[PDB]
Symmetry: C2
Subunit: 194 residues, 2 copies
Amino acid sequence: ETVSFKAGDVILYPGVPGPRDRAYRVLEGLVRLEAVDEEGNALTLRLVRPGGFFGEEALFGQERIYFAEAATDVRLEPLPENPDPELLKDLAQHLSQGLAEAYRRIERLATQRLKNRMAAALLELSETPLAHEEEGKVVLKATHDELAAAVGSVRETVTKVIGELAREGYIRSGYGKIQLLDLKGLKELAESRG
Amino acid sequence: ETVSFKAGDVILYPGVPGPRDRAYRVLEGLVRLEAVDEEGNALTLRLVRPGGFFGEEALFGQERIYFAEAATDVRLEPLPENPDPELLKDLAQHLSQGLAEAYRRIERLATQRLKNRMAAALLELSETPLAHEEEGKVVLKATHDELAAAVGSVRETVTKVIGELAREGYIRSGYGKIQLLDLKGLKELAESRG
């Protein structure tokens, strides 16, 4: 069986999973897992690309501490309540990869300057359906508030970092989009603590 | 089959897993997964308690970006190269829980003050074999350098935070140990952004 969601639609809500809640495997599109505070602002916890899994806590009775939102139009595949061996192995493989990527995020938050973390965030997003190319340059669809959620910062600080990256020539910014001009330069920032 | 390691022994090294590398399930003791930089200093990525799993990347040919060290004497159970369904489900359950805990760590690093994160770190460690009780108070075996690795900070900043917590009466510190005096107070700090 398969289920579809339009960009912006809420797929899962935080809390103790309901008895018929299901985990999902992404077939197409991008899913964003995020923590939302009492003021309605978010912190992106993980991006799930095609082939990835989320909502796994429903298989184990574990509390869901995040919202699962459709970043783009998505087509999902609900997992059975009792995944067979091969599906379970694929789930485990992806949870292992996800945990390692979370480790990398922890490393960045603990040791990397915001400007450098933003460069990494921009490159990461450039590998998703939220980006494409215009005039031969990668163009990302992302507002400053979304970028703030991506690097775990606030609008003002992000706006200042984006402005500096723009003035230096790494990117161009406007109309809810970011155009990447110097990919090699951004990669160098992303790989440095700053 | 079962294997044992003494406190301080390296269980796994970072890099591409060897063809006979195995994942492990902890039977007794505490295992610490940590990232180590070029200067030999660490950032703790995850603590694995009895029943937990680590080294899972060996099951999937994924690069290991951490060292697996025996925090205390440990007894481990190597997983077969092809875990049966029930073992695989337990592994997945623990990777899911581990990922959720990583999400919480990301939230703390992005929104919580160091003093408050230290309170959380102290309480977390108090639930492991690294702690016990003396004079009716929890006493944690942890040097300032280890605490720095636990909260992703540096020795100096940790020393100052520990000194303030001590002067205020939350803890007592000395001889590589931390004595928790006000558990309720520490919990309040741990649950607040600061």
